[PDB]
Design a protein around this ligand. Structure first.
Ligand SMILES: CCCCCCCCCCCCCCCCCC(=O)OC[C@H](COP(=O)(O)OCCN)OC(=O)CCCCCCCCCCCCCCCCC
Ligand SMILES: CCCCCCCCCCCCCCCCCC(=O)OC[C@H](COP(=O)(O)OCCN)OC(=O)CCCCCCCCCCCCCCCCC
Ligand SMILES: CCCCCCCCCCCCCCCCCC(=O)OC[C@H](COP(=O)(O)OCCN)OC(=O)CCCCCCCCCCCCCCCCC
Ligand SMILES: CCCCCCCCCCCCCCCCCC(=O)OC[C@H](COP(=O)(O)OCCN)OC(=O)CCCCCCCCCCCCCCCCC
Ligand SMILES: CCCCCCCCCCCCCCCCCC(=O)OC[C@H](COP(=O)(O)OCCN)OC(=O)CCCCCCCCCCCCCCCCC
Ligand SMILES: CCCCCCCCCCCCCCCCCC(=O)OC[C@H](COP(=O)(O)OCCN)OC(=O)CCCCCCCCCCCCCCCCC
Ligand SMILES: CCCCCCCCCCCC(=O)OC[C@H](COP(=O)(O)OCC[N+](C)(C)C)OC(=O)CCCCCCCCCCC
Lengths: 182, 124, 648, 89, 481, 83, 85
């Protein structure tokens, strides 16, 4: 994507020069000058350069474009605030229902929200390798290891048998780890 | 000015108006006010302890004095409790002996054990 | 089709869908839809109750785990048993009726979507409260009903008194909740779990001091919830909310959460007789005080609420006797006719152009409002336990269990509760007479325009009337049966006395409450209609005692001045004198002053002076070291003094 | 399913960190197994109680007493107490 | 990469002129990177996993694989991972909450904010006392500058408080760290429970460490700087300070104090309980008589930290888990309340006095709903993480000392009092005469508040979802023979 | 009766006397979502439902109590109040 | 619901004064009549009248305003100025 054109900025600059400052540019509230303010402010949302030129070109074009965009920003938002009118469509219409995108929404909505969704998913699924499940499996395996005949019993009788054996005996190894105690 | 806690603050003000605080709830509600709900007019001076005297402050009641209301509260409680306690003495005795249960009071069925039948076990 | 699932989830839908979509649906559909969902829930609950009476094998619903740390294993577990199904009967019946009633009562108001959503929310969270299988889910419901109570009592947000009442209610119930949290901590420590099954399995073996601690904490919570005399002031402030809210709160659910908490804890309660004693006597005190205030109050809703308080204390007594079935049955029976009282009161208020609630300004409306009169009359007669009515089979037998109690001391409680009953007949008759039987007191235009309410208001009163006449008789066997095993609470055989209270009772004690009730009713009516002077005297002393009784027994004064206001004053003392006083002294401000002075002193003839300085340093050092050689302890004060000279 | 080999603090030289970590982890895992035993006891007690109802006392006395017994001993206690102290001396 | 990325940064700056889009993008990438790390994190092991070393003599500018380790150590276990995830969640919201209200030197402001966030995130990675202390102090210059330049009217005094109080505590922390360094000649966190100092020396070191903890948490009676620094901080400073920098204290207890000074901690625990009960009761009461919105919200945090401390020194697994969960829930909720009071109301009306505000429901119903939800969350409604934290912390505290914990159960009531007293006045009544109607909460503000609300609700309904990272930690620090 | 109210105030509850002109069609959508959610959850939670008694056998109960006695005898365990 | 009209207020007030006994005459009661002068009401009798008026229309008159109304026109306009009447 390359869209810069130095011919257009060197023209846009004096097209701006004719206009009063954006602070005082609408304080009248004739319609002709307000119309030109409408089109020039509309230029703000008409994106005019992509990535291939910001990477490649020199900084004089940079400063000029930066000043141009600053003044376009001011005209657009000052009109939009002191007129209750959008600078699109080109003379100042009221059609505020939709066609409004703030700059933060793309980054946040398309990166941050997916990231939190991913975090929730990862936590839910990392919750499965919990020590409680590991210890239930280990206790079951210890019972089966010491006492493999309940491996012959049918499925529904098994679990009751393991529970019986767990209740009766201390299948843990903790005291075995505490050798200096005795 | 009136209350002890407002009086306590008098050395701690320097060049601030020593206002006499009046409960805003007791300001009669038919005068007109800039904010009718708070019964305050604009730029009215505020007492240092204002937050205890505005409309949002805990309600105050005018009927009885606080000390008098305390007397009544404690009096009701004392007379009720004392009358009940003294009434416990002038009590009729029952007519049927309390009920009993088989197996030494079912001390087996409420858990229990042979070595401890006093902890668990009925009148038998 | 799963009864328990639909029971928990339809009210949840009726709550959330209005909140999600109210702007898209509008209050017409929102009202109709929430009402319909609650009706379906109620029908499902009835069917479940029918089957449970057929087969007492409760359904359990066990869902994902809340907590699995160390020994504590908490799960979202729900069950519906005899106790729970009784509570759910009360809750769903009255919620459905109130939802229907609010269509008519609230037809004018701008904000109906929010109102109906809140009613449904409160129903849902109460169902969660009574259905959960461990104390944690109980607590979740316990606090969310408090949140909804805050949101309902302050429904008319622009009214200052409304929000102050909402704050009062939420804060007092948060007191109850602080004690409940203390209880939860001790339960978890002592038993290692919160589940009902384990606690009830191993309760009888536990040390009694620990049980008393647990049960005192939980009873303080229920005391706050059930507006016993310790924590009751919010109960009468709550009628700041709309009348349907008061109908739901004071009959079926919000005030019955405490009684349910005690009833669920019954198995624990048995092994802790001390708290049972305390519960019994607090209940007696509450019923007496509520009746006394009820006589001398002049607001319709306040009267009905104080009646609620008295009945709550009476079931508290029933708990104190270990007659748990007795108190449960009264709770269920009381819910119905209490809701009917409140609804009829709402109709009476709505009939007046002024919409006044004062009883001294209603005059005679018996000709104008016969249907409301008959509904309120049925409700009152059920409440006075007139023979052959639902309130009879609850109230009379609770009164008699006190005399039948094995403990000798409970005979005083008999006379206290008896006084409370005739006390109750007094204010019921006062309201009835002053609303329908007295000469008109309101201006002429109101009596011209006085008319009945719409169908949405009338039908639920009709249904609650048939309930408040027939339910007690049709259900007396289930809860008060000679050998009934429906409610499975394990009563200590020593404590059980329900046979003794029936066989030992004499004709005098078994007839005296009924005869006194009928006489005192007639006496009050005839005295009002024929000798008004005896009521409308002018004695100074009697006016004083009446004033005491009228202001909630001057308790509200005591609280607001001696607890709340003194605490605000003490908070001011802390925040100023400690925090912005002493702590800043030993902080930025004191240090700033100290450094200012010390720095000024150390800065406070460019040559001669400096030469004098160097001599003084040399000689001072020599003498100081001489002293140090002598004894080092002696030089410390000298150094302190030198620094005092230089810096101060 | 992993079954790491058990190590004890008493045998090891505390200067090999791998062994010390293994001892700490082994002690923790044994505590967790003991917890599982306690929970199994408690679940059996719950089933016993729910099915025995009125005679749960006689039916479940053994389970209730055993659960109450294992409660103070089968919780977590952490390894610092035992690695930092040698009980012999 | 770094060279190329620097080029990208420079070009974006030259063309766009405001760095803030680049910083938002960067922070989102950092969040994604930490999530990737969580994916690859082994939870069946109590060992630090993503280790690396900096400023080692053999490679001062790179990572060290040498057999002698004289640089600074970094690495994570589950306990560090939890707080790191919290941090990377909070940073982009901190950038976003000031997206429009900073119109001057904005690039510097966003740079300071992102730098503070990165410093805290790195601080959680530190694995030895010296690097922990370095990154623990590195924020103070940034906070000082930020508060002084972009703060409200009383910001100069605020900046001086935030620097001086924290330095005051940190230097006693430095005494303790120096004593440990010269006594052990080691500083790491990996094996510092293996060294058993004499009881007297433990008792002495514990004093410096706990003085630092008193100033930073804060605890009574040295909490008076926090309400100021909060009230005059800009929104990003307040959100960061409430949501991360306070949790640095709790992490400091768990990481620096408990594994090394176990016996001295056992000796000193009742003193800790005295101080925590003091902070809870007294600050909760003092909150009743405040007249500034941000000051009241600031006072709430101190009480919740008091409950956190009571949990973390309870010598029980439940107490520690409750302290961690309460820290996380507080990091979700308190930034939201600060967002309300200091970014919505303050940016619309530029005042914080409570008397001006009343009846906001009529014009701004959505803001009123948000206030109600956040306040019931702050006072500990169940199905919110705050309730789980307070409940578990109180369980641990009651077990450790039944009387003190039982009395501490009054915090539920006290919190309800101050918070609901505030929200009662704010939401209801007739719309204030002093202020005029303004817009309701916007899409950005609603987005931030929704993030925080859903986070606290998620961990409030199923607090177990954190256990996979913390089940080692709940045993790593309790001292039972 | 009624009074004027600001139309710009947007509340998810709808505000003042909210009664949208397409309320019947939105109502059809709402009731469809309602039946869908209620039925889905009623079916989904069906497997987690069970009765209280009759789940385990007397065999399991008695053998578990016997095992508990065995455990209490391996250790030295007297009963409550047995002293 | 119910809404009153100025003429309804005036009619109710006229009937009220008609039934009062201490009045001089019934026919002489005019819309602009002065109770003090035309109807010859006492200091306290007009007080009784204002109490009757508030009891009839269901309102509450402050002390400063009750004494201000001297003519029946003043009373009718005052009662019409209050929304809840
Ligand atoms: C047995 C002892 C009973 C203890 C009960 C619990 C005390 C806390 C209750 C606080 C409370 O409810 O105050 C609410 C108060 C509204 O009261 P009010 O103005 O009268 O309501 C008018 C509505 N018709 O609204 C307010 O005033 C709010 C202002 C703060 C209220 C609490 C002040 C702190 C004082 C200590 C409270 C208790 C401390 C712990 C005990
Ligand atoms: C004889 C037998 C026993 C003798 C025992 C030891 C003798 C001690 C001598 C006491 C010296 C006291 C100091 C002194 O002379 O102070 C006077 C002078 C202050 O003079 P001025 O300029 O008026 O200061 C007022 C501030 N607005 O101050 C000065 O002239 C300047 C101070 C010079 C003194 C040097 C002291 C040596 C350092 C002591 C360390 C201080 C504490 C550190 C720990
Ligand atoms: C001014 C305050 C005082 C300053 C003192 C310290 C300043 C440090 C400057 C920041 C530099 C640290 C961040 C980069 C170091 C990590 C680079 C790395 O490669 O990670 C090493 C680790 C192991 O990698 P390896 O062994 O090579 O195996 C790779 C297998 N494929 O691989 C991993 O496991 C990944 C490790 C991820 C680390 C996350 C770090 C969080 C924040 C990153 C940027 C922070 C910049 C801070 C700026 C403010 C200053 C504090
Ligand atoms: C108050 C403010 C205080 C500020 C404190 C911040 C201090 C910043 C010091 C930066 C050194 C730390 C860099 C982290 C190491 C990350 C890294 O690995 O960078 C790559 C390269 C060396 O990488 P390598 O050793 O080969 O290991 C990778 C193997 N997979 O690393 C390099 O080649 C070096 C490139 C970094 C040059 C930094 C120069 C100073 C910045 C100006
Ligand atoms: C340094 C290496 C790490 C930096 C990481 C971020 C790099 C990019 C910073 C940036 O975006 O710009 C910073 C700031 C804004 O640039 P700019 O818009 O040009 O300034 C307006 C006037 N020209 O540029 C500036 O405006 C510079 C103004 C400096 C402000 C002076 C006071 C700030 C002091 C910072 C405290 C540092 C204390 C160090 C102690 C330990 C800290 C870890
Ligand atoms: C479990 C989590 C459940 C989360 C629920 C999701 C929230 C969605 C519902 C919120 C929308 C309600 C709302 O907008 O209330 C605004 C209300 C004014 O709305 P309205 O009645 O239409 O108009 C009056 C003046 N305009 O203004 C008000 O009066 C405030 C009332 C707010 C009601 C919120 C209900 C939620 C209560 C539970 C909070 C628990 C926190 C934990
Ligand atoms: C609107 C209320 C509906 C509730 C019931 C309807 C659900 C239908 C399925 C029933 C099973 C169930 O509810 O659990 C849902 C799942 C499945 O858990 P399970 O193993 O099957 O349950 C165990 C049953 N045992 C004990 C028989 C084995 O648990 C979980 O992922 C836990 C994570 C919590 C949710 C993540 C937070 C996101 C919420 C966002 C907050 C705003």
């Amino acid at each position: 994507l390359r869209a810069y054109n130095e011919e257009k900025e060197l023209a846009l600059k004096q097209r701006l020069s004719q206009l009063p400052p954006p602070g005082k540019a609408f304080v009248t509230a004739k319609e002709a000058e307000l119309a030109e303010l409408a089109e020039i402010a509309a230029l703000y949302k008409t994106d005019r350069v992509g990535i291939l030129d910001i990477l490649l070109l020199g900084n004089k074009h940079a400063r000029l474009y930066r000043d141009n965009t600053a003044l376009l920003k001011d005209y657009y938002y000052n009109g939009r605030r002191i007129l209750d009118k959008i600078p699109v469509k080109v003379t100042w219409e009221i059609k505020r229902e939709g066609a409004e995108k703030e700059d933060w929404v793309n980054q946040m909505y398309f990166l941050y929200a997916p990231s939190l969704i991913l975090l929730l998913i990862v936590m839910v699924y990392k919750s499965r390798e919990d020590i409680t499940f590991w210890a239930k499996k280990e206790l079951d395996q210890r019972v089966l290891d010491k006492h493999p005949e309940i491996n012959d019993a049918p499925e529904n009788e098994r679990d009751a048998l393991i529970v019986e054996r767990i209740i009766a005996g201390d299948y843990d190894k903790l005291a075995s780890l505490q050798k200096k105690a005795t | 000015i009136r209350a002890s806690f407002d009086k306590a603050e008098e050395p701690m003000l320097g060049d601030y108006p020593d206002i006499d605080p009046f409960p805003a709830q007791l300001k009669n509600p038919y005068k007109k006010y800039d904010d009718q709900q708070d019964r305050r007019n604009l730029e009215e001076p505020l007492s240092v302890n204002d937050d205890l005297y505005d409309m949002w402050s805990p309600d105050r009641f005018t009927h009885f004095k606080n000390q008098d209301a305390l007397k009544y509260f404690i009096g009701f409680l004392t007379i009720f409790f004392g009358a009940s306690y003294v009434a416990t003495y002038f009590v009729p005795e029952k007519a049927a002996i309390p009920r009993e249960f088989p197996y030494e009071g079912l001390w087996k069925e409420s858990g229990g054990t042979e070595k401890s039948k006093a902890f668990f076990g009925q009148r038998s | 089709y799963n009864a328990i699932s639909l029971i928990i989830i339809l009210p949840c839908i009726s709550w959330l869908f209005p909140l999600f979509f109210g702007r898209q649906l509008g209050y017409v559909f929102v009202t109709r839809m929430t009402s319909t969902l609650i009706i379906i829930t109620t029908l499902i609950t009835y069917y479940y109750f029918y089957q449970l009476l057929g087969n007492n094998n409760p359904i359990n619903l066990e869902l994902f785990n809340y907590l699995n740390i160390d020994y504590l294993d908490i799960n979202y577990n729900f069950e519906i048993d005899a106790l729970t199904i009784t509570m759910l009967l009360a809750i769903t019946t009255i919620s459905s009726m109130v939802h229907i009633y609010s269509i008519g009562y609230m037809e004018t108001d701008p904000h109906q979507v929010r109102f109906f959503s809140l009613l449904s929310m409160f129903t849902f969270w109460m169902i969660i409260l009574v259905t959960g299988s461990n104390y944690f889910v109980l607590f979740v419901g316990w606090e969310f009903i408090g949140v909804t109570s805050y949101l309902l009592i302050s429904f008319w947000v622009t009214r200052l008194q409304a929000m102050k009442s909402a704050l009062s209610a939420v804060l007092m119930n948060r007191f109850g909740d602080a004690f409940f949290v203390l209880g939860l901590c001790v339960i978890a420590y002592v038993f290692g779990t919160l589940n009902y099954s384990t606690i009830f399995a191993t309760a009888y073996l536990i040390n009694t001091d620990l049980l008393v601690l647990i049960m005192l904490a939980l009873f303080i919570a229920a005391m706050a919830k059930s507006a016993q005399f310790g924590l009751h002031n919010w109960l009468t402030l709550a009628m700041e909310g709309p009348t349907p809210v008061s109908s739901l709160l004071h009959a079926a659910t919000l005030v019955t959460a405490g009684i349910y908490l005690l009833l669920r804890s019954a198995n624990i309660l048995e092994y802790t007789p001390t708290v049972l004693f305390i519960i019994l006597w607090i209940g007696a005190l509450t019923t007496l005080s509520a009746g006394l205030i009820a006589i001398c109050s002049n607001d319709l809703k306040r009267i009905i609420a104080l009646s609620t308080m008295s009945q709550l204390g009476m079931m508290t007594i029933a708990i104190g006797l270990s007659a748990y079935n007795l108190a449960l049955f009264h709770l269920l029976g009381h819910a119905f006719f209490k809701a009917l009282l409140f609804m009829s009161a709402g109709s009476i208020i709505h009939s007046i152009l002024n919409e006044s609630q004062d009883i001294r300004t209603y005059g005679g409306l018996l000709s104008y409002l016969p249907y409301t009169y008959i509904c309120i009359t049925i409700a009152s007669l059920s409440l006075m336990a007139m023979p052959g009515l639902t309130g009879y089979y609850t109230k009379d037998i609770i009164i008699e269990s006190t005399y039948g109690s094995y403990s000798i001391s409970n005979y005083v409680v008999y006379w206290i509760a008896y006084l409370s009953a005739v006390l109750t007949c007094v204010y019921s008759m006062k309201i009835l007479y002053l609303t329908f039987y007295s000469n008109p007191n309101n201006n002429t235009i109101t009596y011209y325009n006085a008319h009945e309410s719409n169908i949405y208001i009338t039908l639920p009163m009709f249904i609650l009337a048939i309930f408040a006449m027939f339910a007690g008789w049709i259900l007396k066997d289930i809860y008060l049966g000679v050998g009934t095993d429906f409610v499975g609470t394990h009563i200590l055989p020593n404590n059980f006395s329900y046979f003794d209270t029936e066989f030992s009772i004499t004709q005098f004690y078994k007839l005296l409450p009924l005869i006194s009730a009928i006489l005192v009713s007639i006496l009050i009516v005839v005295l009002n209609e024929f000798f008004a002077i005896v009521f409308n005297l002018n004695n100074k002393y009697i006016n004083t005692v009446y004033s005491i009784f009228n202001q909630k027994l001057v308790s509200d004064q005591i609280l607001n001045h001696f607890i709340i206001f003194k605490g605000l004053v003490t908070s001011g003392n802390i925040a100023h004198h400690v925090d912005k006083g002493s702590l800043y002294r030993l902080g930025p401000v004191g240090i700033n002053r100290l450094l200012n002075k010390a720095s000024y002193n150390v800065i406070n003839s460019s040559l001669s002076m400096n030469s004098m300085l160097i001599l003084i340093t040399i000689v001072s050092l020599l003498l100081l070291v001489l002293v140090m050689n002598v004894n080092f302890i002696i030089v410390i004060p000298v150094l302190i003094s030198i620094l005092y000279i230089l810096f101060s | 399913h992993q079954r790491p080999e058990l190590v004890s603090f008493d045998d090891i030289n505390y200067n090999d960190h791998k062994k010390v970590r293994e001892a700490q982890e082994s002690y923790t895992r044994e505590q967790f197994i003991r917890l599982e035993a306690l929970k199994t006891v408690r679940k059996a007690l719950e089933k016993c109680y729910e099915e025995s109802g009125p005679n749960h006392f006689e039916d479940c006395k053994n389970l209730a007493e055993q659960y109450l017994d294992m409660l103070p001993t089968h919780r977590l206690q952490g390894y610092l107490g035992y690695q930092r102290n040698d009980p012999s001396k | 990469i770094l060279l190329s990325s620097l080029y990208l940064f420079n070009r974006i700056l030259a063309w766009q002129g405001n760095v803030k889009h680049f910083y938002l993008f960067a922070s989102n990438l950092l969040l994604l990177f930490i999530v990737v790390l969580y994916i690859n994190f082994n939870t069946f092991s109590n060992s630090f996993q993503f280790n690396f070393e900096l400023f080692n003599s053999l490679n001062p500018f790179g990572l060290s694989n040498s057999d002698i380790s004289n640089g600074l150590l970094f690495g994570i276990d589950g306990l560090s991972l939890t707080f790191i995830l919290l941090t990377v969640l909070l940073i982009p919201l901190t950038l976003l909450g000031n997206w429009y209200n900073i119109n001057f030197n904005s690039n510097l402001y966003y740079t300071l904010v992102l730098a503070i966030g990165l410093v805290i995130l790195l601080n959680f990675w530190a694995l030895d006392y010296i690097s922990f202390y370095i990154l623990f102090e590195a924020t103070l210059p940034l906070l000082f500058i930020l508060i002084h330049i972009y703060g409200s009217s009383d910001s100069e005094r605020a900046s001086f408080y935030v620097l001086m109080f924290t330095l005051s505590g940190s230097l006693f922390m430095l005494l303790s760290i120096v004593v440990i360094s010269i006594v052990l000649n080691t500083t790491n966190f990996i094996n510092h429970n293996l060294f058993v100092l004499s009881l007297d020396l433990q008792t002495i070191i514990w004093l410096g460490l706990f003085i630092a903890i008193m100033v930073k948490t804060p605890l009574f009676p040295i909490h008076v700087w926090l309400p100021v620094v909060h009230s005059e901080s800009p929104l990003a400073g307040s959100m960061i300070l409430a949501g991360l920098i306070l949790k640095l204290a709790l992490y400091a207890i768990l990481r620096l104090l408990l594994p090394l000074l176990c016996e001295a901690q056992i000796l000193y625990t009742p003193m800790i309980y005295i101080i925590s009960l003091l902070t809870i009761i007294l600050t909760s009461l003092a909150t009743l008589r405040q007249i500034d919105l941000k000051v009241i919200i600031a006072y709430s945090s101190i009480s919740h930290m008091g409950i956190a401390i009571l949990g973390v020194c309870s010598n029980t697994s439940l107490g520690i888990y409750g302290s961690i969960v309460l820290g996380v829930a507080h990091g979700f909720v308190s930034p939201a309340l600060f967002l309300i009071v200091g970014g919505i109301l303050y940016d619309r009306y530029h005042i914080r006095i409570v008397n001006y505000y009343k009846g906001l429901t009529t014009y701004m119903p959505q803001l009123a709903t948000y206030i109600i939800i956040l306040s019931f969350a702050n006072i500990g409604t169940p199905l919110t993480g705050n309730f789980t934290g307070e409940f578990l912390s109180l369980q641990g505290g009651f077990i450790r000392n039944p009387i003190i914990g039982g009395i501490s159960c009054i915090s539920v009531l006290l919190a309800a009092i101050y918070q609901l007293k505030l929200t009662n006045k704010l939401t209801g009544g007739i719309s204030s005469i002093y202020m005029h109607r303004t817009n309701d909460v916007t899409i950005r503000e609603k987005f931030i508040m929704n993030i925080l609300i859903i986070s606290t609700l998620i961990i409030g309904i199923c607090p177990q979802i954190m256990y996979n990272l913390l089940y080692w930690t709940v045993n790593n620090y309790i001292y039972i023979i | 009766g009624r009074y004027p109210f600001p139309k710009d105030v947007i509340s998810m509850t709808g505000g003042w006397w909210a009664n949208p002109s397409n309320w019947k069609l939105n109502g059809l959508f709402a009731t469809g979502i309602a039946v869908g959610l209620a039925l889905w959850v009623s079916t989904a939670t069906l497997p987690y439902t069970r009765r209280r008694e009759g789940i385990t056998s007397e065999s399991d109960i008695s053998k578990w109590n016997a095992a508990a006695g065995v455990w209490r005898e391996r250790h030295g365990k007297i009963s409550t109040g047995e002293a | 619901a119910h809404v009153l009209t100025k003429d309804m207020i005036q009619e109710r007030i006229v009937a009220l004064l008609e039934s009062f006994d201490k009045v001089n005459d019934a026919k002489n009661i005019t819309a602009t009549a002065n109770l003090t002068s035309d109807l010859g009401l006492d200091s306290l009798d007009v007080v009784e009248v204002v109490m009757a008026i508030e009891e009839e229309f269901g309102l509450e008159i402050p002390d400063h305003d009750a004494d201000e109304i001297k003519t029946v026109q003043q009373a009718i306009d005052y009662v019409s100025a209050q929304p809840a009447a």
